[model samples]
Target: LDPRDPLLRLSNFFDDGSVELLHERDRSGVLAAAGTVNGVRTIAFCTDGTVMGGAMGVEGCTHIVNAYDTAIEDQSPIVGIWHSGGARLAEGVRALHAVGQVFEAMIRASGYIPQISVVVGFAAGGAAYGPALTDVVVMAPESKKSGVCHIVADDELDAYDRGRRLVGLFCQQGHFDRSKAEAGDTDIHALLPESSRRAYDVRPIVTAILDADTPFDEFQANWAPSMVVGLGRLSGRTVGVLANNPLRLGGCLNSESAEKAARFVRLCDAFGIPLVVVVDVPGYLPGVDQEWGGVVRRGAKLLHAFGECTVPRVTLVTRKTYGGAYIAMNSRSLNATKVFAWPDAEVAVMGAKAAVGILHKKKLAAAPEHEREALHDQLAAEHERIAGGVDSALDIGVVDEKIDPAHTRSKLTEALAQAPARRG
Candidate 1:
């Protein structure tokens, strides 16, 4: 199948010629088909780019709605390969109603089934909004992005491949056989720097925990680099990973990162995929820029996302977690299934030195210049001894346990496996 052929592209989505066109007699600009994607039943439709720029007419919209109807009935995932120039110009007002029906059908399916959209060609006007409504929108290179698509591909074929992987990630619902499972001999503990003050990329830690052979399909990687959210497998089961990259904004949760993480959390919960949160956050980014950027309104999204998430979410603190970012990253207070912290990790309102600076501002000022440094150090040490450390968090029942990084995979898997498999 040539990549440019819309029919050929739709056929490639299914398992080798397993595609069966729905409404075979319909001459719509859309090609709707049903088949198994990666051995799981899935419905896929591609807009016929050759037909009037794949504009959505009444017939084309009918095909899309039918595809959704079939997907919802079978309780299977659906993929939309979009390449269009919006509504049909000739159809006029009727085309708008038809396009609106497609939107209604998409919203109806919502959390009941996984919806993915892949844009390999021009998707403007109404065509753009179609992909925006789905759970994940995979777009080809040079496509528009004003906070619409989730995963942007390197090329057209890459976009379809990404959509295929997402279908498998959302549909695969089995645990990996432990006896036959490949041993994870690679150590992830060494991935983090020895110095807690040092900043490093968190992607290595994330990939190490996921299935080593499979690719980690990250969502909006470039949009919010500080917060990492993506889908991967643990013990052969698809799970979502949320982590903070200290290398970016010192791993602080900004407005953009909060919104990004919040949407991802909701996505995973909607699809019933478990979440693994790797936390090492300092706090929310503080500055005039953030405040003016609607940080308060935007940062609240993370709170709401974790507060209402029903999927089994387990958090692991590799370093320190301070202030609101701690709670935002699946804290015990957020109803996380489990919260694991490394022995040396600290869970506090803020860092020891910063806490001391605020509380002992007068005392530090009164002391001599040389003595003030020593006094501040002593106060910070005392502050940490009393309010900091994973031990304190565990004692208060916030942190479930202090886990050794070596046993992280097994511990997280057990926690997720034991949680009730319930999804709204």
Candidate 2:
């Protein structure tokens, strides 16, 4: 969806030949309609980027208010494609008042529907910060006049490898309305460790799944580096991401990480932003430090948050989902809207290496210390083959499907659309 101009950008978000105008005025600022995007229905509003250098005033603000009203009534996603200057000073101070009211409408609309903003051109003042209040933001780059933005691209996307992401953010969020679509580098499978007994960072995987134009508004980054929590976009749609960054503390959910994840989950759920949990956790971080830090008390927060969320959430198991940590990471038990897995992902009480020690305790106890490693290997292989792999998880519905890494983005987009979403 190149969106030859602002009006086309707006029209591109709805189903093909489905866009219908909702509002009209002197400057050509039009609030439009929606039909479907990949079979998913939604509502989106686009201002006149071509008019007055994409400025806004009473007419635009009134349209926005109506957009929110319509979205709230339908309980569907509403996106704003902006390229506006501050207020339409062409109307004087009265225009500034209208901008303020638009802010009120945006605020009032929060937590009720998915609000996405994409600035394809230079947007200053009100047009800029307004996006900050929405659930997701995408742009040609970012706001040059103000500090508000989701990602900064230096005004050249559509324009690098990163461009695909910005456009993806735009299309998936608002572009989806257009129901149009591209791809990029980064393979989800190769990024993981080659050996099952090995460890690797989940950052690459996280980076792969998110929009490349911005930082993952990572929360508690310095506190608990392991249990990664942040806000990122997939195909432009805003999603609350909680992934175990295996690079730090081996991606285990410890006291700090648990509390960190709990807060993130509740916040996103409150805003009606969907959640995405990428798993590779081995177990809860071990030791006196965690126990003393109130692991149980803090840990239950994650459980409670997930169990209590009404917004649709999806879990993507990257590697192995082992034990209590898996439960805390939005497994089927947590009532995740749906769970997806890569072909090699493992989901069970524990991984084969550790599981073998418990299941074959007697056999290992009889083995000499020198033979223990070899014995463990044999047992792990047998166990992985017989149970605990992605196949086994699917056998009992632990995982919804075993997917291809290359197809992950589309799968998630479809899944998010299918899941119950958009409620105030």
Candidate 3:
């Protein structure tokens, strides 16, 4: 194989010297190959950026469809190397048909085989949607977003490394090996702040729960920073972790984050990966902007995704989970296998202070200015005692148990093990 071949970028995706060219006779705008990644059988194709700007013509698309068939027949994962300006404009409707065939093959292969897309350069038109149908998308620096890429990397090489990690995580199915892993001496509580009102990045807490040997593959790391969706190994088993980032928008549910999370949830479910939902949401972000911008319709996607999922999903309430966002985060109401909360977690219709403001406005208004502050504090305390606290949530069965932060990893692992192995 020539090092300067159009498919050169795709060769690095597989184990060293393991890539074997497929349909070498066709020098169309795409290249296909069968290979191995870390000993796992894999197939991948790359668009020929050197040819017509990697435009998709009939023959080029045929190569992709054939690659998909090979991966499905071999029960292997397939990766798509994208960097195209979309369909061959000169070919017009003929190119459109070719691109559509690629989409159909991809859709048919969905859930049956692991499909990943790595966009190393500009992708638009038909080139854009090709990756959208895949299970995971890793994009290189300066690549198009438009909701097409899942994980963004520093460069093309970084994107390949990420793709390799994902192949192992998705294809190498196993349970968490307790013997190989070390216990963390640091307290998980240290990841959180003492004040419930204070915001903290939830990534560290999520990372701590996953296997230390391999870092979690965070999906859509930049987009919708408030809601995190990623795949990681727990007790040696690959699982999805969906967490709210209080550091962003106080971890509130908004249109963008909701849609972002919904797609991730569905993707995990389809792949038979169980979920770990780490919730610390204040509520839905309120504003005319969100409301008019489709928070009502967009945010509901979370509810639908979680409710419809067949894989076991366990939830952990680290702090505030209130209002509509409470149930949206894979609560027991949505058939979550287990719902655990931090000892001091607050779960309710809303926070105590906010609930008190709405429910005891008259009493606060009637009180003298000097006593208003004291009254408000007293009312808020009463609200928490009666409704908002973890105790109340446990009593209502919304939260199944109260857990110490230190034992989170083991507890969540056990919960996933005990839950039904629901997969299609």
Candidate 4:
């Protein structure tokens, strides 16, 4: 978006070596480049809007196909820049057929290599779906005016991060890898409220874990408000963040939230992108609506997603975890790389009060009603101290360690870098 140079933006993503043009055959409306990003190899391309407004014909489409081929052969990620009026009208259906081949390339490489797209300007008709098919899309403000971009980016960032200006410090550092990260301050814990039940916005917490002031290329921000899924930088390395919004549906997973989170997990795993999940959910929503809408069937996808993931993933429970939802949301049982809980975090199959109510119902019912309330309270506290709390979870090794809020960033980056990095 700055200096009117596409190559400059592409170069900003990769750290070493030049952004080499691939199959640059006499102005094909789209130019493909291949190189490494932060010392990690990947492929990238941008439209040549200068010629024919960056229209696509069969010739240009072949370049797109070739770009995918090169990335696949190298087993590296591919990123595309879109700013088009869809298929080139002059080429008619031939252009459409060519676009089809590009689609084939993306589909073939879906599970093996990462595919990311950025929309800098108008991407209408067929071009709209191109970004949708990829793993992540970071939209520019100018693109939103034409209505094909992701979100209405705040002018604060747009004014500073783009156009005749230097990349933001975090973005510049994060554009490369861990070694490129710069010193910074964080206030991740400050954004969280002292009262756990009072419910605060999850976005601040999500942003804090990543590099200070880094942008979250958030997807599906409105759909299934309970689940927060997005791309972020953890210590200047690209990692996906999956956080639960307690303010929404009380941070409970239902049919829609489970399905939303499932797709995000699958994408991160496929791309070999490291994951950092911030868990603060009570349990799944209980209602006839969820069951009738296929909560079990949909919820199973999320559990399978975590269990099947091969990439390094870490989970942190900032508050408490309970019920089957705990198991589905990347718990210790899911073979997570590491599971952490805040010092005051708690975990259990169910909360003490609920478990006590069900297990000691007869004893409570036989007592006087007023006495029953106090008796229930006593039993719940006993249960809490005995086996249904964070200490109990730690005792059984369900929790790996107690993570201080102040030190969570470094803990995650070190754990992620410890794993054998994936080529995707």
Candidate 5:
């Protein structure tokens, strides 16, 4: 096998997957490849599994690190699809040192260029950290299964087991899993249109409702397959957007998603970009590992970023905005400029049914079954109308106005236009 033939194999792989490989050369080759793909101004590295199992040796890691650094220097996004087996033991410690260099490069590039990692196969041990440091991670179901295989069979089960630990660790340390408590059990799909049950694209809704001509430019479009963060012009002004993909993880906030949004919010604040949060989250993903990931500390950054923002912040309550998520996403106390609610938007400290169960516990125990539901419904309606609806929001001034779905853009435009530009 030719040492330089890996590019040819990668080309064939992209072809088999029905993806056109725009460029197939080395550093110089990548420049040519990028020129061929329309709107492709930058190039990222794809580890060719055909080459020594796509291990991160001196050459491979160097190429990736350099490409990422260049993208950052140019203020472009780095789209990486890495399938590696840690360091190339052939080169021993030299290979190991290369991996560390790659990690350092990713960190340096952090706030400059958006880094997206697409885990196509086994990303174990030190190999996993590079992706973790990125802005978003997209994993194929098949890719996750492959990592599981490595965990179960490898002699160094410690590395694989550590990969599992790091999965959540990276998220928390990176400040990604913001809603550790009170992430509800409601199926995120229930929030989408019925026709979208099989088709999980929420981009249409994002485009239809967001500022015209500029579709939300999703980061990590190919990686982390779920969870989305992007920058877009909202009401003719730049704003950072973080929307959960319920199709993946049932729309729960995972470590990766949480970290991505946390960092995105920080970037927005640093740059004076406003925020337009559109929440359809069920809650945070549950696992002992998640808790250990410092979910509380990491998730708190979301609240901090939202609360500290002096810009024109607005939140649109799309569906289920519950628990701490409501607080993190700019509910009443976060000092958001305005909060808009749809008629279907369910706003509560907790889910309505659950809240009823908790509050009416003694009353329900004393009353008959039929009588209890009526009481629950009465209380629920009163709470929903008084505390959750536009009228209730108006009384307390949590929301400036309740709007029809059709008039969302005009409303946002008018509000944003009237709101004063933020002062330093």
Candidate 6:
């Protein structure tokens, strides 16, 4: 089957299961496809891997570019399923140059449309870069991975492994895992029951913490289950929320999560919406795969967005806030207007257990077998006493106030009431 012909199959994945295909047979066909899809207000792109290995020929590149352009114009989401081998070898340099053209288009779309790339097959060489350029990337386990190369050779196993690892790291650090749960999924709601595990569903917390009875409308709810983005009201004023759900994968920022948060930050900035970041992340996901996927590069987008956003941003550390995850969650260092912590919240460079494991390794090793446990416990408790809760964080100005969970809504309402309203 022609990979490009899977438009019907791709359409089936959407809510309506109906999609207009853009046959990249000519420039006009590309424009027509973009217009048709954009006109229908759709926000996804599924390119077929079977069609010329999903290579970007002149027309194919044109089609892709048009889709990106439309997404930016509409401020909608863009998902590109990349399974290409590379630029069309049959078309020579003209096809190769199309890769750069597509890159330019994606760069321009940054901070505008939320661009996501899903690698479903062998995405090698220039074809691989397509996914790299996007805000989020999704990869199937079986796909043959390679770095951003213009061509893939026969003996590139090492390169393939490297690329795979890179993508994994990118997914691990660049975004929070959003695809693990659906909106209002029962498993996600179950987080409320696991209150003892330091896990929380940021969505309901967001709803409960926001002004009473305000509805939170999430973006890409099905794509990133760990990171949440949405709009709600605080003190009757609309505000944007960027939160990490500790219930999923310990709220680690993966490629998708990073992209989700980054895009959400950009949107809030563009619309002059005050931001409230509810953080409970452990850290970035660990593994070599995350490193190879341009995790650092993709993760930087979140940092950049947070740093540049001048809106009144507030961050609440409801539970665990450790390592770089704290930084990514819009901590005070990110220019947040006010930083609040719950009475149970733990704000540290690392979790108590992890810190004890690393820093007290020698101390525990030298202690008697029975005494080791006691020493570790003592150290952990001390750390908790020193760094846990609002008083500790407030002393260092990391936390402005210590709030009760029940009073979360009132606190936020009062804060927003006195805070400057968002200006256009």
lDDT of 6 by residue, 1-424 (tens): 5434445435433334345554544322122233123123444555555566666678777778877777777765566656667777888998778878989998898756555555556777777777777754545544633222212212323323322332222222121112211112232223355454656566777776554454555655666578887665555556778888876877788777887788778766765567788888888874356463645766888889888887778787877788887887887787777787777677888878768878889888999998888899899888777765567778888788987665555555455445665521
Candidate 3 ranges beyond 4 A from true positions: 1-4, 142-144, 177-186, 287-293, 366-370
The C-alpha RMSD of each candidate to the native structure, in angstroms, is 2.1, 9.7, 2.3, 5.5, 10.9, 10.5
lDDT of 2 by residue, 329-402 (tens): 88788788889999878788876777899999998999999989998999899887889878788889889988
Q: How well does candidate 6 match the true structure, expressed as C-alpha RMSD?
A: 10.5
Assess candidate 4 and give its lDDT. Answer: 0.72
Tens digit per residue, CA lDDT, model 1, 7-67: 7988766788788888783457898988888888899899988888888999999999998
Residue 313 local lDDT, model 2: 85
Error of 5 at 375 (Å): 5.9
lDDT of 5 by residue, 204-277 (tens): 55565555554455654544434566665554445566666656766666555665667667766654566666
Q: Report the C-alpha lDDT of model 4 over 1-424, residue by residue, as the tens digit.
A: 6433556555655554657878643667777888755455668777766667667779888888898999899877787877777889878889999988888888898777766666677777667777777755556757632222333344422422321111121122242244433244354677778886678778888877776755676766877789888776776667778888988988888887898888888877765577888998888874564354567877888888888888888888888688888888788888888888887777887778899999899998999977899999999998878886667788898888887677777766766777665421
C-alpha TM-score for every candidate: 0.94, 0.58, 0.93, 0.76, 0.59, 0.56
Write down the TM-score for model 2. Answer: 0.58
Worst 10 residues of 6 by lDDT: 175-184
Best by TM-score: 1
In order, candidate lDDTs are 0.86, 0.70, 0.84, 0.72, 0.57, 0.63
Candidate 1: residue 234 Cα off by (Å)? 0.4
Task: Evaluate candidate 3 by giving its C-alpha RMSD to the native, one decimal.
Answer: 2.3
Once fitted onto the true fold, the runs of candidate 4 whose alpha carbons sit more than 4 angstroms away are 1-56, 73-77, 85-95, 111-113, 141-191, 213-217, 286-288, 292-294, 413-424
Candidate 4: clashing pairs of residues: none
Ranking by TM-score: 1, 3, 4, 5, 2, 6
> Candidate 4: lDDT of 188?
61
Residue 362 lDDT, candidate 2, scale 0-100:
92
